Structure 1
């Protein structure tokens, strides 16, 4: 269940999963931590801005969250994790095999309640410690003491006491000594929720039949009972602004505000969250604020605020209803379709089965916005029609987006489930556009496509017709009638010349678009379900019913690759931006990465949930997948951005080196008789030849203002024989100069100037003779040719007078004779160069 190419990065589009969020305070700032599957997310409350994300996914889902003063406690299976800034500082694994249900942090103690009615108390080793870390004790709540534990709360000023709310009664424990201090009388109804009031000794209990009971723990009694009939109470909260208001959140999705002083009902907010996902799972009044933060299982997090009263004298009697302040949201159902909205990988478009089309930002979660489905006025002036009770569009099954004309007119086409027309959308305004494109043959829209110019949109119909519309004016331009079964793919090339269609009849049709002719047909063995076209390489891949992927070259109309290995229906596939890879997800819970040059399966991933959509970023840095379960998009990073991956096939285990890594190192020398240059820079020869005048250019024009007395050996403060000359002598002795030539190559140009210029210019000229012999052997080597020529040129510049005045010496004359013998063979390079210039110049100009 791992890949060599793709690594998990994040899952976007998710806000909360219906686990009751925890609120935390830092100074005057509030934050909300919501649960998102196995991670948690922290939001700044004042802006609902994402601050932190849990760094690593937990092995299991998070079941409870708590927050206090920079620290977040998250419960999953038998463990409780203690995190600061998303990073896990500590982990507590309870000795039980049971699962942690509830958490309560107060003072030194962390109390963790499991599903077998056991409470594990942990305490700090030293009261200066930031969090509890070591095990203190375990308390069992037997069935005679009370039912199953509903909550662990801690009332204020209750020294070392924990309030355990069960379905039957309320217990009080001394967590230092382990004693059971108090046990209340049994309540007739099952208690579902509990919340400590901001008054002394009072805890609020919400029951299944709809009762909110104020319980006095010190008196041991009930002081008030509020009845909300035919409602299951899911959340309770108290206002601390100075107004005695109580908020009750029901599982039907309603939020009810009561005035406790006035004994009245202020307001009811109906269906703020969906009943099916659990209604109002959590609603918390912020401390001292007229702001209540609500959430539910439908991937929403909202805020409501109370305005000040319109009456000056009356005030508390005349209360305005709570109003919507701000929210974050996502899909309530898994996404049906995804696409990338631009080349910068800033934004993604995602349509889900809850009939919503959203735009999700990969850079900042605040920029995510739902595309508006508010219709436009018809151009003729007639009424649109449809039901006045407005519902969303049917779920989108196909989408095409082209940003060539963004801001001018519509640039998105969507095909919706079981409809005979396609819809257009504008991405600049983020709203539905004014044209609906029909199939004109009484068939459902199976395919959509768009031109790269942005002027044309294409519809594939379930009856075989292809209609071409104008995206600017919504006017039907043309209709192509080749197919007889459903058209399951259309595309057009980047030059708008050739158009390709594929359908369930097994036919690939190649059309010309400028002239309306048909260029060809191709019959394949199986019906074709989907097509992806790559416009830089003119290559399109087709998914077939025989569980294969067929890559066809469009210019030559030929099947060039065929990919086998998926053991069930190919749900999705996409090209890499350079066209080298195809990533395909199938119904066999595998995502395979295919190399097209080799036609091989280089990578595979065994996924836990079937990936319905796979798209790949135009930057090539990201991969986006959507799965059957989960309301978010999984973002994957491409390891090939930062490292190189072998194209060796990976289908052997489950599911030479130059070819594997798509590289080739040029040889040092192709043949012994071929003249080759040095491996270094080309300018080394020129610098070595004209280094002195480069010096004289590089010197400053005026003498710099120095000190009156400069200390000697300032650079030093900041043997008998050189290694060069030792190598020269031993090379003369052993008649092999290879190491000498190697160190001459690796010397810097100024070092070359020193070691050539400072040779023994006197009798018997042994150093000059040995250097000439070394250069002759280097010329025999046929490598570093220009460097050895430069060395001889530098020798002629430095010691030319010695050689000239001392020629007809036997040793010098014989050395230069050997040099001329080896050097006269190199006139072939002159002939090659002269032929190349003469012929190339004649061919070019004449």
Structure 2
């Protein structure tokens, strides 16, 4: 299931899943650490910003969470994990095959409890250790001591004592010696939760029948029996400010506050979490402050504040109602559709089966919002319809957004399930717009689209009527009608000219939009399910019904690419930003990345959860997908922005590099009879001709001041005849011996321009003129090789600049004139580029100016 194109980033849009979270004090501030499936997140208390997630995901679900001052303790399938900053600092392994269910940490004694009634004790080896690592002992609760371990708590001011609560009784364990020291009397109800108290030797027990039994562990007797009518109790906590407030959290979405001083109720918060997802799983007060943090299975996490009393003198009697504060949340359901709100890869619109629409942010995870379904007032003065008891919109199945003209009117059209109108949404205001677009032929909407200008929105009925609405007044401009089945995709090109459509009759209808004429028809074999248009490349693809992807050019009327291989229904698909790739998610839990040049799959990811949708970002960085299960949105990083991609067909293997990497390196020379230049910068020939004038310009205007007491050989103080001849001169002497200069000319090219002018002007050939003859014969072989011709011409231009007076003085000598005439006979066939240039721009001047 590994991929060579995509790699997972994180799961955008999740807060909590339903596991009882932990909180840890950290100086003055607090951090709320929750878990989402195979990873876990750390939320700050005063802002509810996300701080850290796990760097590497856990292999299975996180079952128990606990947190000390710095080290968060996560407990997945078999092993518990000690983490700091999200980094896996230590992994503590439990030497049993059973599963860990509860995890208490007090002192140097970590307390891991498996599901099969065994408590593991882990000891710090050093008293100054930061987490327990060594294995102390394995306490066991039998079937005669109690039921299964409901929770592990450590009460205050107990020296090496572990408080164990079963389904029927409470036990104590001296973990230094591993011995039971006290057993409670049997509780007739099934205990569901436990919590320590600010008072000493007091633990609060909540049962499945709504009884809070408040067990004094010193006397071994209960004290206060708080009755709640027929409600399953899930959460228990105390307000540790000093005011006597007990928070009991039912699983039916209720939060009940008790004043233990006056033995009376305070407030019953209704529906702070949904019933079906577990209700109020974990809810606790921050230690010493009147802010209670609640979380549940509804993928939300709310904060409530007890305000100070309105009465100046009474205080404790007139207590304020709890009041809503900071809350972060996501969809309670898996998300159905995902689109992108802008080209900056900032905002992601996700419409789920929780009847809502959220605007998540890929940049800052606290920037997410739930977009408001509060209807605008009608312009007519007539009251709108709908229920008085307000409910949410139906589930959204198709969506379209244009980011061109945003904030001046509506720029999102969303299509709901089984509704005869689409709805408008304003992205900038984050609110449902004031226009609804009816199909006007009694039909559900199955596809919607925008123009790229953003003025025009297209609506596809279930009876073929492609109506075209406008954004300002919501007035209906045109009503195209070509199909007989449901229209299953609409688009429009960049020019507002070519309008394409596709239905379940297999018809791809091309319309002109400036006029109102059908441009042409294209009948296929299978019905067309979904269609994504790429506006830059003018190619749109169709997910057919013979389990294939067909790409049709929008202008040239015909099928241009056909891709096969998916073993089930292609669920959704999207184009690459550069148009090179199509990703596609199918119902066989596979994701394939087809490459449109080669017409084949280059990466196949067998994702374990069936991917309902895939969607590229407009920027070439992110692949956003949604799965069948899981409330979040999986984001994949595009690895093409860093590493090159080998376009190879790989689908049969899982389930020459020049053409594969789609980069073609240029040849050094086409053929030996060509006249090709040198590899390098084109201004190297400019610096070799005019080396003196460039330095003379680049000198400063005045002479800089110097302290003339400098060391003479400070350049040679870098802090770190035959044998004294240069490496070029030895190679030039060896070049005459072996009659080959290609070894010499390799170093002649690669030398610096300042080194070359030093080299050419000092050839050590004044009296015998030998190295002049060897260097000239070196450049005869250089021009005969026909490579680096621009450089080799400038080299004798520097020769005639330096020793031009030298060879003019000894002209007519039969050895020097033989070498120069042998160079001209090579150079005599170098007027071909001169004849080529004098022809080519004379035509280019004449043709362009006529």
Q: Would the aligned equivalents of 1:565 and 1:655 in 2 still touch at CA under 8 Å?
A: no
The alignment's TM-score, normalised by the length of structure 1, stands at: 1.00
The Cα of 1:257 is off from its aligned counterpart by 0.3
Q: Would the aligned equivalents of 1:493 and 1:535 in 2 still touch at CA under 8 Å?
A: yes
The Cα of 1:656 is off from its aligned counterpart by 3.0
User: For 2:481 and 2:351, how far apart are their aligned partners in 1?
Assistant: 30
**Any idea what SS the aligned residue of 1:301 has?**
strand
User: For 1:613 and 1:194, how far apart are their aligned partners in 2?
Assistant: 42
Match of 1:670 in 2: 670
User: For 2:453 and 2:104, how far apart are their aligned partners in 1?
Assistant: 61
Q: Unaligned 5+ residue runs, structure 2?
A: none
The Cα of 1:824 is off from its aligned counterpart by 1.2
Q: Would the aligned equivalents of 1:423 and 1:435 in 2 still touch at CA under 8 Å?
A: yes
User: For 1:710 and 1:40, how far apart are their aligned partners in 2?
Assistant: 65
User: For 1:88 and 1:481, how far apart are their aligned partners in 2?
Assistant: 61
Q: Would the aligned equivalents of 1:570 and 1:587 in 2 still touch at CA under 8 Å?
A: yes
User: For 1:331 and 1:21, how far apart are their aligned partners in 2?
Assistant: 19
**Any idea what SS the aligned residue of 2:805 has?**
helix
Deviations 1:780-812, CA, capped at 9 Å, x for gaps: 010110111100110001001110010111110
The Cα of 1:288 is off from its aligned counterpart by 0.7
- Of 733, 739, 752 in structure 2, the residue corresponding to residue 729 of structure 1 is 733
**Any idea what SS the aligned residue of 1:52 has?**
strand
**Any idea what SS the aligned residue of 1:372 has?**
coil
The Cα of 1:762 is off from its aligned counterpart by 2.1
User: For 1:671 and 1:76, how far apart are their aligned partners in 2?
Assistant: 66
Match of 2:387 in 1: 387
Deviations 1:566-609, CA, capped at 9 Å, x for gaps: 01000011000111000000001100000001111111000111
**Any idea what SS the aligned residue of 1:267 has?**
strand
Q: Would the aligned equivalents of 1:121 and 1:137 in 2 still touch at CA under 8 Å?
A: yes
**Any idea what SS the aligned residue of 2:791 has?**
helix
Q: Would the aligned equivalents of 1:281 and 1:297 in 2 still touch at CA under 8 Å?
A: yes
The Cα of 1:703 is off from its aligned counterpart by 1.2
Deviations 1:113-143, CA, capped at 9 Å, x for gaps: 1111000000000110001000000111001
Q: Would the aligned equivalents of 1:404 and 1:453 in 2 still touch at CA under 8 Å?
A: yes
**Any idea what SS the aligned residue of 2:620 has?**
coil
The Cα of 1:620 is off from its aligned counterpart by 1.2
Deviations 1:43-90, CA, capped at 9 Å, x for gaps: 110001100001111111000000011100011111000000001111
The Cα of 1:709 is off from its aligned counterpart by 1.7
**Any idea what SS the aligned residue of 2:105 has?**
strand
The Cα of 1:825 is off from its aligned counterpart by 1.0
The Cα of 1:763 is off from its aligned counterpart by 2.4
Q: Would the aligned equivalents of 1:551 and 1:561 in 2 still touch at CA under 8 Å?
A: yes
User: For 2:124 and 2:331, how far apart are their aligned partners in 1?
Assistant: 42
The Cα of 1:559 is off from its aligned counterpart by 0.1
User: For 2:107 and 2:651, how far apart are their aligned partners in 1?
Assistant: 57
The Cα of 1:216 is off from its aligned counterpart by 0.7
Further displaced range: 717-726 or 320-329:
717-726
User: For 1:290 and 1:709, how far apart are their aligned partners in 2?
Assistant: 77
Q: Would the aligned equivalents of 1:761 and 1:799 in 2 still touch at CA under 8 Å?
A: no
User: For 2:763 and 2:184, how far apart are their aligned partners in 1?
Assistant: 107
User: For 1:476 and 1:208, how far apart are their aligned partners in 2?
Assistant: 59
The Cα of 1:654 is off from its aligned counterpart by 3.1
Q: Would the aligned equivalents of 1:214 and 1:223 in 2 still touch at CA under 8 Å?
A: yes
Q: Unaligned 5+ residue runs, structure 1?
A: none
The Cα of 1:652 is off from its aligned counterpart by 2.1
Q: Would the aligned equivalents of 1:728 and 1:771 in 2 still touch at CA under 8 Å?
A: yes
Q: Would the aligned equivalents of 1:570 and 1:584 in 2 still touch at CA under 8 Å?
A: yes
The Cα of 1:305 is off from its aligned counterpart by 0.3
Q: Would the aligned equivalents of 1:490 and 1:502 in 2 still touch at CA under 8 Å?
A: yes
User: For 1:776 and 1:428, how far apart are their aligned partners in 2?
Assistant: 72
The Cα of 1:775 is off from its aligned counterpart by 0.6
**Any idea what SS the aligned residue of 2:162 has?**
strand
The Cα of 1:39 is off from its aligned counterpart by 0.6
Q: Would the aligned equivalents of 1:355 and 1:392 in 2 still touch at CA under 8 Å?
A: yes
Match of 1:759 in 2: 763
**Any idea what SS the aligned residue of 2:66 has?**
strand
Aligned-CA RMSD value: 0.7
The Cα of 1:407 is off from its aligned counterpart by 1.0
1:236-385 map, 5 Å = 236-385=236-385
Further displaced range: 712-721 or 510-519:
712-721
User: For 2:820 and 2:654, how far apart are their aligned partners in 1?
Assistant: 69
The Cα of 1:759 is off from its aligned counterpart by 1.2
The Cα of 1:543 is off from its aligned counterpart by 0.7
Q: Would the aligned equivalents of 1:14 and 1:330 in 2 still touch at CA under 8 Å?
A: yes
**Any idea what SS the aligned residue of 1:20 has?**
coil
The Cα of 1:651 is off from its aligned counterpart by 1.5
Deviations 1:240-299, CA, capped at 9 Å, x for gaps: 111011000001110000000111111110110111111100000111101100001000
Q: Would the aligned equivalents of 1:761 and 1:802 in 2 still touch at CA under 8 Å?
A: no
Q: Would the aligned equivalents of 1:337 and 1:397 in 2 still touch at CA under 8 Å?
A: yes
The Cα of 1:760 is off from its aligned counterpart by 2.5
User: For 1:220 and 1:239, how far apart are their aligned partners in 2?
Assistant: 24
Deviations 1:732-756, CA, capped at 9 Å, x for gaps: 1111011101000010011110111
User: For 2:449 and 2:734, how far apart are their aligned partners in 1?
Assistant: 77
The Cα of 1:764 is off from its aligned counterpart by 1.6
Match of 1:572 in 2: 572
Deviations 1:670-716, CA, capped at 9 Å, x for gaps: 01011011011111111100100111111111111110322110111
The Cα of 1:518 is off from its aligned counterpart by 0.4
User: For 1:275 and 1:837, how far apart are their aligned partners in 2?
Assistant: 82
**Any idea what SS the aligned residue of 1:557 has?**
coil
User: For 2:143 and 2:119, how far apart are their aligned partners in 1?
Assistant: 14
The Cα of 1:313 is off from its aligned counterpart by 1.7
Q: Would the aligned equivalents of 1:164 and 1:171 in 2 still touch at CA under 8 Å?
A: yes
The Cα of 1:312 is off from its aligned counterpart by 1.5
The Cα of 1:404 is off from its aligned counterpart by 1.1
The Cα of 1:547 is off from its aligned counterpart by 0.3
Q: Would the aligned equivalents of 1:614 and 1:624 in 2 still touch at CA under 8 Å?
A: yes
The Cα of 1:623 is off from its aligned counterpart by 0.2
Match of 2:483 in 1: 483
Please state if 1:145 is matched with 2:145: yes
Q: Would the aligned equivalents of 1:237 and 1:285 in 2 still touch at CA under 8 Å?
A: yes
**Any idea what SS the aligned residue of 2:212 has?**
strand
The Cα of 1:336 is off from its aligned counterpart by 1.0
Match of 2:235 in 1: 235
**Any idea what SS the aligned residue of 1:752 has?**
helix
**Any idea what SS the aligned residue of 2:654 has?**
coil
Deviations 1:503-540, CA, capped at 9 Å, x for gaps: 00010000000010001001101000011111111100
User: For 2:661 and 2:88, how far apart are their aligned partners in 1?
Assistant: 38
The Cα of 1:326 is off from its aligned counterpart by 1.2
Q: Would the aligned equivalents of 1:355 and 1:393 in 2 still touch at CA under 8 Å?
A: yes
**Any idea what SS the aligned residue of 1:533 has?**
strand
The Cα of 1:156 is off from its aligned counterpart by 0.7
Further displaced range: 277-286 or 705-714:
705-714
**Any idea what SS the aligned residue of 2:10 has?**
strand
**Any idea what SS the aligned residue of 1:659 has?**
helix
User: For 1:730 and 1:529, how far apart are their aligned partners in 2?
Assistant: 76
Q: Would the aligned equivalents of 1:198 and 1:240 in 2 still touch at CA under 8 Å?
A: yes
The Cα of 1:223 is off from its aligned counterpart by 1.0
**Any idea what SS the aligned residue of 2:609 has?**
coil
